[PDB]
Amino acid sequence: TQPALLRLSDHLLANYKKGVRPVRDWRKPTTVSIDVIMYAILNVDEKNQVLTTYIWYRQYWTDEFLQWTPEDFDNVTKLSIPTDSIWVPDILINEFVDVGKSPNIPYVYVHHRGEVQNYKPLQLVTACSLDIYNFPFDVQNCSLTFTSWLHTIQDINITLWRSPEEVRSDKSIFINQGEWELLEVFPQFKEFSIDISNSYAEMKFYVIIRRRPLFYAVSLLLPSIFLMVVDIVGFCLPPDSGERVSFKITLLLGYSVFLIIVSDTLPATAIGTPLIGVYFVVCMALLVISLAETIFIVRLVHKQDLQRPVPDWLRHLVLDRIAWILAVRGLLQELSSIRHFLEKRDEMREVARDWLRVGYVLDRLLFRIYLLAVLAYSITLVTLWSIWHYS
Amino acid sequence: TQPALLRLSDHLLANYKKGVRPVRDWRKPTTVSIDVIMYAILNVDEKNQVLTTYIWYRQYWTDEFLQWTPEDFDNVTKLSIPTDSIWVPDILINEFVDVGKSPNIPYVYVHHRGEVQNYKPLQLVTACSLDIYNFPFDVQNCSLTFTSWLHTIQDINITLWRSPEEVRSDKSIFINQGEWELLEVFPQFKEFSIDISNSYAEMKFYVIIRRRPLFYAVSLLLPSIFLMVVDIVGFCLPPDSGERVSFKITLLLGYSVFLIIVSDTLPATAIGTPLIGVYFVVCMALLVISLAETIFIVRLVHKQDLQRPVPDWLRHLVLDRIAWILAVRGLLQELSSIRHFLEKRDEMREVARDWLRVGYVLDRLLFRIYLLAVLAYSITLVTLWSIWHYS
Amino acid sequence: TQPALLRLSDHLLANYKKGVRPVRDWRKPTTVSIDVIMYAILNVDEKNQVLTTYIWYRQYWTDEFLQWTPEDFDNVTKLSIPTDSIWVPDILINEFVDVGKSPNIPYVYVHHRGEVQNYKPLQLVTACSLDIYNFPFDVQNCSLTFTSWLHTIQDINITLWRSPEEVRSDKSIFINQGEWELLEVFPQFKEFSIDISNSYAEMKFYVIIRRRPLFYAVSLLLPSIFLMVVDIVGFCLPPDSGERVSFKITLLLGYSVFLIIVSDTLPATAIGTPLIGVYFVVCMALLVISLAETIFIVRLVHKQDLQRPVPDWLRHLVLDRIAWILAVRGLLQELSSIRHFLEKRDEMREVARDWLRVGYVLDRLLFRIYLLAVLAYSITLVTLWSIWHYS
Amino acid sequence: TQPALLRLSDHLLANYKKGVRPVRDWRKPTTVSIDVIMYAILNVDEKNQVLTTYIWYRQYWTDEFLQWTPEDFDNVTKLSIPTDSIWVPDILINEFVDVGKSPNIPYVYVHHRGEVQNYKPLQLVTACSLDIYNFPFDVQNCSLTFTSWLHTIQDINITLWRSPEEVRSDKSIFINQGEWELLEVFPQFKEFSIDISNSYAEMKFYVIIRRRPLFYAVSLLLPSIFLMVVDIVGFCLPPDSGERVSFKITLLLGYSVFLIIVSDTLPATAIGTPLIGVYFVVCMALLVISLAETIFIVRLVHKQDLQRPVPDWLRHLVLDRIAWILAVRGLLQELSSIRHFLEKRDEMREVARDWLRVGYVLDRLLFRIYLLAVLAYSITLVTLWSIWHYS
Amino acid sequence: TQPALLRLSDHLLANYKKGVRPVRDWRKPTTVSIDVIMYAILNVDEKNQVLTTYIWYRQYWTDEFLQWTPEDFDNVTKLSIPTDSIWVPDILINEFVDVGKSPNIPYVYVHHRGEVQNYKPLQLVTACSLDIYNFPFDVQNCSLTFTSWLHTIQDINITLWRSPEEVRSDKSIFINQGEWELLEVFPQFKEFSIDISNSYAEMKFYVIIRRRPLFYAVSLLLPSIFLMVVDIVGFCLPPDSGERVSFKITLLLGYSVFLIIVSDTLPATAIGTPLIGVYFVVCMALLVISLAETIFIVRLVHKQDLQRPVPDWLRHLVLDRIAWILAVRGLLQELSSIRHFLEKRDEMREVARDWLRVGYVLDRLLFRIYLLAVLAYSITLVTLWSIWHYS
Numbered sequence A, B, C, D, E: 001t002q003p004a005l006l007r008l009s010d011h012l013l014a015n016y017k018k019g020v021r022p023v024r025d026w027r028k029p030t031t032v033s034i035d036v037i038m039y040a041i042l043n044v045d046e047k048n049q050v051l052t053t054y055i056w057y058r059q060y061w062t063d064e065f066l067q068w069t070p071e072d073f074d075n076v077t078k079l080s081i082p083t084d085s086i087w088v089p090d091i092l093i094n095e096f097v098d099v100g101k102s103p104n105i106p107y108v109y110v111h112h113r114g115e116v117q118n119y120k121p122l123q124l125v126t127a128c129s130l131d132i133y134n135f136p137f138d139v140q141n142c143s144l145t146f147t148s149w150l151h152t153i154q155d156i157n158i159t160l161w162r163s164p165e166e167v168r169s170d171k172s173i174f175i176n177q178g179e180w181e182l183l184e185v186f187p188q189f190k191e192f193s194i195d196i197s198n199s200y201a202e203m204k205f206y207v208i209i210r211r212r213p214l215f216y217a218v219s220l221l222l223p224s225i226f227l228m229v230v231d232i233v234g235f236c237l238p239p240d241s242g243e244r245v246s247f248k249i250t251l252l253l254g255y256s257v258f259l260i261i262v263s264d265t266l267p268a269t270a271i272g273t274p275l276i277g278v279y280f281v282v283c284m285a286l287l288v289i290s291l292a293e294t295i296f297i298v299r300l301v302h303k304q305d306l307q308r309p310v311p312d313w314l315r316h317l318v319l320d321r322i323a324w325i326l327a328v329r330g331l332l333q334e335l336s337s338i339r340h341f342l343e344k345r346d347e348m349r350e351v352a353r354d355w356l357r358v359g360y361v362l363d364r365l366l367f368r369i370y371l372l373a374v375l376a377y378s379i380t381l382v383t384l385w386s387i388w389h390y391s
C-alpha cells in the first residue's frame, strides 16, 4: 500500500541528465566552496625536491537541479546518494610527481537547498622548493595550489568558507612526537592568464612546516666537541718531533672517515649548499695547510738547507711587529787524533740548534689564525641559533 | 514446467534500487557489526615510521530490503549474491601510506533475517609511531582506526560483536618462527568532533607487536666482549712505551670500522635516539680522551719540558688524598778528558728517571674511571633486561 | 536463409542470469577441479622472508546451466565464450605481499556435459619461512595454500584430479641453468575452523625448491684456504720479534675488510643465524685473544717486570704435565774503571735471556688449541656435506 | 512549462553515434591542432639514460557532427560535455619507459563552429640520449615526438597553431631556483615510412634543457686546489729522504679516498666517458709512476748497486743537452791498529756521496713534465669554459 | 534527406554478437598473421636474470563477419572502428616478471575482405638467461615466445607474413649511440604438448643483442697496466731489506681497495663466474704466497735458525738443475782484552753473510713463475679478443 522512501530517491533521480553543467542561467557562475585540513604529514625524502602529505578535503557546490520540500516526505533533510550519477567539477593539485592512491567512496549528500556536499581523504606527493642554507634548522616553506582545470573564472567560483584567523591556527588535529610540525597556513586568491581573453581560477594554500633538530643537535655538536679535543691535543706537543706528524696523519684519516659517516648518513641535494659541510671542508683545507706547515717543520730540523733569513725574512719580522704585534811524539800525536775525532763526534750537535726557534713562532701564528677561525664559527653558530629563536 | 531457484534471486533482485540508504525509518540508524583477525604480519622496514600488516576482516550489516521465508522456497537459508548490485558502507583505515593491493571478490551472503555478511582479506601499510629508546627490546606499540568516513553517529552504528576477554587472547591463528609476535589487542570506542553539531563515528584497535632479539643478543653482546678484551689488553702494558700507542691507534680505527659495520647493518631513524650507539660514541669519546692522555705520556718521556709540580700539582695531590683516596801531564790530562766525555755519555740517563712515576698514577686513575663507567653500563644493561622481563 | 552458429551462442546466452550460484539442488555442493604446474620460478630476494614464483593454473567446474546436444548443431563439442558473462568462484592464494600482475584473458570453454574450463597464468610473491642454519646448502621448504574464501565445505568441493605419483615427479617443463631447481611437490587436503559450526575448504601445495652453491663453494672455500695460508705463515716465525705483530695487525684489518666484502655481498636475515659467519666471528675472537697473547709476548721481552714463577706457575706446569702432557796507580785505576764500564756495557745482555723460553711454549699451546678448532670445523664441514649428500 | 538548457545537451547528444570517424567527406582529412607548454620539469636521474618531465597539453579538433545556432538558445557559445561520450584521436609520446600517472578529467568544450577543445596535464618519463663528454657543463639536448599511432597522413592533419618565434621564447611560466633551466624549443614536421604505400604522421618537439654547476664548481675546483697544494708540498723536500715516501703513500691513499667520495657521490653512465675523472685517473697514474721513481730514489741511496753511467747514461745526458736543454813496538802497533779501525769507521761515509746528484735532476725533470701537464689541463679547463661561454 | 556514412558503421555494427569465435565453418581454423619490430631496447639490469625491451607489434586476422562492397558506399576501403566491440584473440609473452605499462588505443581497421588489422606498442621486462663467462664481451643471447594461451593448434594459425631474409637484417629503425646493439633475429615455429591429445600453438623470436665494451676496455685494461707497473717495481729492489715488505703490504691493501672499487661498481650474478675477477683473486692469492715468501726472507736474515741445507736442499738443487735448469804485564793484558772485545764487536758481521745467497734465487724462481702466469693470461686475453673478432 505505502512504499518506502526509496521512490523519493527515484524522484531525486528521474530526469537528472548527468553530464550537463547545472545552472538555471548560464552567465551566472556556479559556486564551489572548499576547505582543507591536515591530519598527519608523512616523511620528506627531500632528495628529489619532493614532499609527501596526507590531508582531508571538504567541498560543497550548489547543484540547483534538486528541490526537496520538508512537508510530506518524512523529514529527510540530509540523505546520501552515489556520486557516480551526479555532476562533479575538477579540482586538482598541480606540480605533482604522481596522483595519490586515494579511494573512490561513492557517496555524497543532498539536501533541501540543492547543494551537494563531499568529503574525501587524499594524499599528495609533489615537487616543491626547500632551503638547505642551514641544515639543522630548516624553514621548509611551501605552497600548494588548487584550480578548476577545465573551467574559467566566470564558470566556477572559489570560496574558502572560513575566516582566516581560525584558518591561521588549526592545531586541534595533529599527531604527537612527529618529526615535522606545522605552525600556520595562509589562504589567498590569485589568477593566472597565459594569453589574452583567457583567465582561469586559482586557489593557493601556503604552508609552513617545521622540524626540530633534537637528534641532529647532539649528533652534530659533539663532532665539534671532538674538533676542540683534537685542537687542544694539537697544542701541548713540541712541533719539532715527528710523533705529532705520525699521529696527525692518522687523525686526519680518522676524521675524514667519521665525517664521511656523518655526511653519507645525511646527504644533501645538488641545488643547495650545506654550509656546515662547507665549513667541515674548510677545516680539512686548513688542516692540510697545517700539514704542509708540519712537513715544513719536518724538513726544518735537517742539517742541509739553503734559506735566506737576512734579506726578506727580517722584513717579514718587522712587518709582523708593526701589523700583527822516539815514540812519545807518536803517542801524543795519536791521542790528540783521538781527541780530534771525539771533538768531531760531539761537533754533530751544534748544527741543528739554530733552526728550532723559528718554526715554533710560525706554528703559534697559524694556531692563532685557526683559533680566530673557530671563534668566528662559534659566533656564527650562536647568531644562527638566535636568528632561529627570533622565528 | 518448474523453473530453478534462480528466479528466487530475481525475486531478491527485482526492485532493489541500489544506491539508497536502506532503512525503514530514517532517524533509526543502521547497525554494522565488525571483527578483525591477524593471520600473519609482514616485515617492518621502520625507517619511514611505517609498518606493514595483512589481516582478515569480517563484517555484517542489516539491509532490511530483503525478506525470505523458509516455506516453499526449498530451504535456502544462506545464499550468495554479488556485492556490485547491493549497498555497502565505507569503512576505511586511516593514516595510510597507500591502500593495499586487495582483491574484489564480488560475493556476499543473504539470509532470512535480512542482514548481509562480508568477508575480505586486506593488507595495510601505514604510518605509526615506534619507540627506539632501547634498540634490541622494542615495545612497538601501535593503534589502527576504522571509521564511517561519509556517515555520522546517527547514521552508522559500530558493533564489535565479541566479548573483549576472547579478543584479548587470539593466538590460535598465527605463523610460527616469525620475527614479530603479538601478545594482546584492545578494542575500544571513541568519538572525534572537528566543529560543533558534527560528531562522527570511530572504532580503534590497539595493537602490541613484539620481536625478540635472538639474533641481536649474540651479535651485539660479543662486541661488548671485544670491548672487555681490548680493555684488559690495555691493562698489563707499561704506559711509557710507544708500542701501546702504535697499537691503540690501529685498534681505534679497527673498532670504528667494526662498529660502523654494525651500525650501517642496523641504522636508526631521525626521530629516536638509540642509546646503545650513544654509549658506543661515549666509549669512542673516552678512548680519544685516553689517547690525548696517551700522547701526553708520549710527550712526558722527553727531556725538555717546563712544568710546575710545586705550586698546584701538590694541591691536586692533597685534594686526591682527601677526596679520592814533560808529557805525563798531557797523558793524564787527555785520559781524564776521555773520562769526562765518558762521564757525559752515561750522564744522559739520569734526565728521564724523574718523569716516569707520575703518569702511571694518572693512567690508573683514568682506568678506574673507565672501569666504573663500564660497571655502570653493566648495571644499566641488567636493569633494562629486568625491566623487559617484568613485561 | 540459414544463419550462422552464433545464434547457438544466443541459445547458450539467452536466460543465463549471471550472479546466482549454479546448482539444480542446493545442498548438493558444486565441484571445482584444480591443478597447478610451475613453468619457471623467479628469484628469491630472501631478505623480506619472501619468495617469487610464476605458475600456470588449470581449473574446471560443473556449471549445469548449459546443455548442448551433438545432433543438428554442426558438432561444436568445444567452444569458447567470455568469462565476464558467466559464473566464477574465488580461489585465492594466501599470505601474499601483493597480487601478481596477471592478465584478464576473458575466454573460457563450454561443452556438452555442462562444465566450464579455465586456464590462467599467474605469478605470486608471498611471505614464507626459509632456513638459514647452513648458508650454502639451503632446504628452502615452503607451502602455498588455495581456498574458497567466501564459500564453505558444503558449498565448493576441491578436486586435485591427478594421481599423486605423477604429481610427485613433474620435471618435463622446467627451464635450464636456473639458480633454483625443484625436486618434488606434495598435494594434500586439510580443513581449518575458526569457531564452532563454521568449517571452510582448504587445499595446500607443499613445495621443495633447491639451489646448488656452484658459485658459493669456490668463492667461500678459498677464504678458508686463505685462513690456512695465514695460519701456516703464523707458524715459522719466532714469537719474540715485533715483526710478526706489525704484520698481524695489518693482516687482521685486511682479513676484516675481505670478510666484510664477502658478508655485505651476501647478507643474512634478522631471524636466522648463519653459522659460517658465526665461525668467522669466532675466528676473529680467537685471533684477538691470540693478539692479546702476542702483546703479552711483546711485554715479555722487556727488562722490568714483577711476575711470580715459583708459587703458582709451577702448579700450572705440573697440571699441564698431568692433564695436557806516583802516577802508575792512577793509570791502573783508570784503566780498571774503563774495564768496569765496558763490563757494565756487556752486562746489559743477560737480563733478557731468562724470559724467552716460557712464552714460546704458551704460543705453541694456543696454536694447538687453534689447530684442534680448525680440525673440528673441518669435521663439521665434511659432516654437513655428508648430511646434504644423504638428501 | 519552460525546461532548462539541459535538453539542448540532449539535442547535442541525441544521435551522436560514438566510435565512427567524424567527417562529412571521407578523403578530406580531419585536422587536429596542438600546442605544448612546460610548467616545471622534474629531476633527471640520468643513470638509466632517462629523463622526467611534467607538461601541459592543449589540443582541439573539428568534430563537424555538432551544429549550434546563436539564436533562441540563450547564447551558450561555449559549453562543457564529457569526453567519454565523444570521439578522441590517439596522440601518444614514444620511447617512454612507462606512461605517466595522469588524471582522467572527463570534460571537453563544444561551440558553434563544431570543433572540440581539450586541455590536459601529463607527465612523461622517457629514454633519451645525453652527452657526458664534459661533466659540470652539460648540453642535455633531447627530442620528444607525438604521432597519430593508428591513423595515416590522409587521416589526421597536424597543426602547430602558433608562430615559431613566440614558440622560441616561452619563459613566462617557469619555476624559480630549479636545477634545470630551459632556453629554447624548436617545432618541426617530419614523416617516417616503414614500407611502401604507408606514410604516417609525425610531430617532433626539440628541447634544450640546461643546468648550471653552481654547486659543482666550488665542490670540484677545490680538489684541484688541493692537487696544487700537494704538488707544492711535494716541491721543497729533498728527494733522498724516506720521509717524503712515508708521507706520499698515505697522501695517495687519502687522495684516492677523497676522490672515490667525489666519484660515488656523482657516478657516471656506461655509455659516456667523464674526462674529469679520466684526468683524475691520469693523475693517479702519473703519481704512481712518480712513486716508482720515488722508490728508485729509495734504492738509489744504498751502497750496493751495479749500474753503468759511462756507456749509455752519458748518451742520455748528451741527448738531454741537445733536445731538452821490548813492548813499545807492541804499543805503537796496537795504537796504529786502533787508528786503522777508526779510519775504517769514518770510511763508511764516502760510499754514498756519489749517488745523490743524479736522482735530483731526474726528479726535477719529471716535476717539469707534471707541471706542463697541469698547465695543459688548466688551458683545457679555460678553453672549455670559454666554449661554454660562447653558447 | 541523405544521412552520413556513420549509418554504414551501424550496418557494420548491427548484429555482430561480440564474444563468439568468428568462423563460417568450425573445423577450419582462423588465421592470425603477426610481425614484430624493435624500435629501442631499454637497459638490462642483469642482476635479476632479467631484461627490458620496448617493441612495436603488428597483427591482423580474418574476421569474416563483416562484408563491404565498393559500390554505392562512397569508396571507404579502410575505416577505423573501436576494438572494445569486436573479437580479439590472446597472444601473450611468457616468462615475464610483470606486464608492461601499455596503453589501450581502442581503434582497429576494417576493410572489404573482412580481416581486422591491429598495431600496438608494447614493452616487456622478462626473465632470460645471459652468459657471464667473459665479462666485457657478452653474447647476450635470448628468446621470446608468443602463443595462443586459450586456443589450440586447430583453433588459431600463426603466420609470420614476411620472408626470413628481410627479417634477418632490420636495422633501418634503431637508435644511435645506445649501449646495446642488435645484429640479427631468427623466426621459427615450434609446438609443445604437455599431455596426450592436447597440442597448442607456439611462435618464437630468437634475439641476439650485443654491447661493446668501449667504456670497459679503457677502465679495465689500465688496472692490468697498474699490475705490470707494480710487478716491474717489485723487480729492481733487493729482497733482503724490509722496505719492500713495508711497501708491499700497503700496496696489497691499496690494490684490494682499488679492485673492490671496480668490482662493486660492476658486480656479477650468483649463477655465472666472471673469470676476470677470478684471475684477480688468483693474483691476490699468488701475491699473498709471495708475501709468505717475503716474510720467509724477513726471517731468513736473522742470526738464529736451525735449517738443513745438506740432506734434502741439495737434492732440491740437483732436481732444479735437471728439470728446471810489575805493571807492564797488566797493561799488555788489559790492552789485549780491549783488542778481544773489539774483535768480538766486529765478529758480529760474519753470521749473516751465509744466508743472503739462497733466498734471492728462490725469489727469482717465483718471479719467473709469476711472469709465465702473466704471459699466459696475456695469451688468454688475446685469444678471447680473437674469438670475439671471429664473431
Ligand SMILES: *[C@@H]1O[C@H](CO)[C@@H](O[C@@H]2O[C@H](CO)[C@@H](O)[C@H](O)[C@H]2NC(C)=O)[C@H](O)[C@H]1NC(C)=O
Pocket (backbone or CB within 6 Å): E070, E071, E072, E073, E074, E075
Ligand atoms: C567507388 O569506386 C568505383 C571505382 O572507380 C566507382 O566506379 C566508377 O566511378 C567512376 C567515377 O565517376 C565512374 O565514371 C564509373 O562509371 C564507375 N564505374 C561503374 C562501373 O559505374 C564507384 O562509383 C565509386 N563509388 C562511389 C559512390 O562513387
Ligand SMILES: NCCc1c[nH]c2ccc(O)cc12
Pocket (backbone or CB within 6 Å): A037, A056, A057, A058, A119, A120, A121, B147, B148, B149, B150, B194, B200
Ligand atoms: N572520518 C570522518 C571524516 C571527517 C571528519 N572530519 C572531517 C573534516 C574534513 C574532512 O574532509 C573529512 C572529515
Ligand SMILES: NCCc1c[nH]c2ccc(O)cc12
Pocket (backbone or CB within 6 Å): B037, B056, B057, B058, B119, B120, B121, C147, C148, C149, C150, C194, C200
Ligand atoms: N578461507 C576463509 C578464511 C576465513 C575463515 N574464517 C574467517 C573469518 C573471518 C575472515 O575475514 C576470514 C575467514
Ligand SMILES: NCCc1c[nH]c2ccc(O)cc12
Pocket (backbone or CB within 6 Å): A147, A148, A149, A150, A194, A200, D037, D056, D057, D058, D119, D120, D121
Ligand atoms: N589550470 C588551468 C588549465 C590551463 C591554464 N593554462 C593552460 C595552458 C595549457 C594547458 O594545457 C592548460 C592550461
Ligand SMILES: NCCc1c[nH]c2ccc(O)cc12
Pocket (backbone or CB within 6 Å): D147, D148, D149, D150, D194, D200, D201, E037, E056, E057, E058, E119, E120, E121
Ligand atoms: N605511428 C605509427 C608507428 C608505426 C609505423 N609503422 C608501424 C608498423 C608497425 C607498428 O607496430 C607501428 C608502426
Ligand SMILES: NCCc1c[nH]c2ccc(O)cc12
Pocket (backbone or CB within 6 Å): C037, C056, C057, C058, C119, C120, C121, E147, E148, E149, E150, E194, E200
Ligand atoms: N599456451 C598454453 C600453455 C599451456 C599448455 N598446457 C597447459 C596446461 C595448463 C596451463 O595452465 C597452461 C598450459
